[PDB]
Amino acid sequence: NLNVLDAAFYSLEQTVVQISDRNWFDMQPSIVQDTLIAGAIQKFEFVYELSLKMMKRQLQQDAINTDDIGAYGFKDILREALRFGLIGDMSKWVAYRDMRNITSHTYDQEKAMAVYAQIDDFLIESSFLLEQLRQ
Amino acid sequence: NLNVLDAAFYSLEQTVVQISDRNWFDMQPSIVQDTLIAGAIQKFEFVYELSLKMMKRQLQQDAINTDDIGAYGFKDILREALRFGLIGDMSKWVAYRDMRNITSHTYDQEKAMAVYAQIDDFLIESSFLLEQLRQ
């Protein structure tokens, strides 16, 4: 499992890299560009959703009990994830959830630009998150 | 707002066309090939969702004295849409949702190929719907 989040993190990272190579990206027809952006938003969603689940799982393995939060709030998952040092800034994640909740609006190109602009930062935290989880 | 459904559809279609250009697509780097399939899948989700939003608004504005069509779930919307000849086979839209509900597993390349392969048919059906709504 953790391998899966790991494979999904890299594929996202790799994807931003290709899109970053501004030489090759600007050459491509516009439909190729917007499809890569969408594929990147889709890969963002995977890492985000896989991250929560791995994060919820570590949390359940380290708690006094799973009854408490696992049927309880996002924010509570974060604070707790923060306490065990799983993440560094629950404000990045509150933001990430806001991001994920609107990816379904991504057919609008502006909105797509807006989500893609936040992905590089996104890679940072999730990178941290996963490092934590490897240990 | 019919324009959005129309433009998401056409943008999907155009995505599928570039992907089918085997000579062009076989040359691309590995990460470009799958980001593109990732993206086409994301785009499939947009038309599906929008297509259902439109059947909904259609039935919601159509005969309804705006009877908070909330009492309505997926299958009522599909049944009403059939009553209006907006779709012609609901077993298919039922299957498009099962497809939609597994796209979150698309980080696995094989599951992703399996969903992408179903896009051609989706285009036929989704385009019929858009035809009826055009009137």
Curated annotation (Swiss-Prot), chains A, B:
<keyword id="KW-1277">Toxin-antitoxin system</keyword>
<feature type="active site">
    <location>
        <position position="100"/>
    </location>
</feature>
<comment type="subunit">
    <text>Homodimer. Forms a complex with MntA, probably with a stoichiometry of 2:2.</text>
</comment>
<keyword id="KW-0378">Hydrolase</keyword>
<keyword id="KW-0540">Nuclease</keyword>
<comment type="function">
    <text>Probable toxic component of a type VII toxin-antitoxin (TA) system, probably an RNase. Neutralized by cognate antitoxin MntA. Neutralization is probably due to AMPylation by MntA. A mixture of HepT and MntA binds nucleotides; the highest affinity is for TTP, ATP binds more tightly than ADP or AMP.</text>
</comment>
<feature type="short sequence motif" description="RX(4)HXY motif">
    <location>
        <begin position="100"/>
        <end position="107"/>
    </location>
</feature>
<dbReference type="GO" id="GO:0004519">
    <property type="term" value="F:endonuclease activity"/>
</dbReference>
<protein>
    <recommendedName>
        <fullName>Probable ribonuclease HepT</fullName>
        <ecNumber>3.1.-.-</ecNumber>
    </recommendedName>
</protein>
<feature type="modified residue" description="O-di-AMP-tyrosine">
    <location>
        <position position="107"/>
    </location>
</feature>
<keyword id="KW-0255">Endonuclease</keyword>
<feature type="active site">
    <location>
        <position position="105"/>
    </location>
</feature>
<dbReference type="GO" id="GO:0000166">
    <property type="term" value="F:nucleotide binding"/>
</dbReference>
<dbReference type="Pfam" id="PF08780">
    <property type="entry name" value="NTase_sub_bind"/>
</dbReference>
<keyword id="KW-0597">Phosphoprotein</keyword>
<dbReference type="InterPro" id="IPR010235">
    <property type="entry name" value="HepT"/>
</dbReference>
<comment type="similarity">
    <text>Belongs to the HepT RNase toxin family.</text>
</comment>
<keyword id="KW-0547">Nucleotide-binding</keyword>
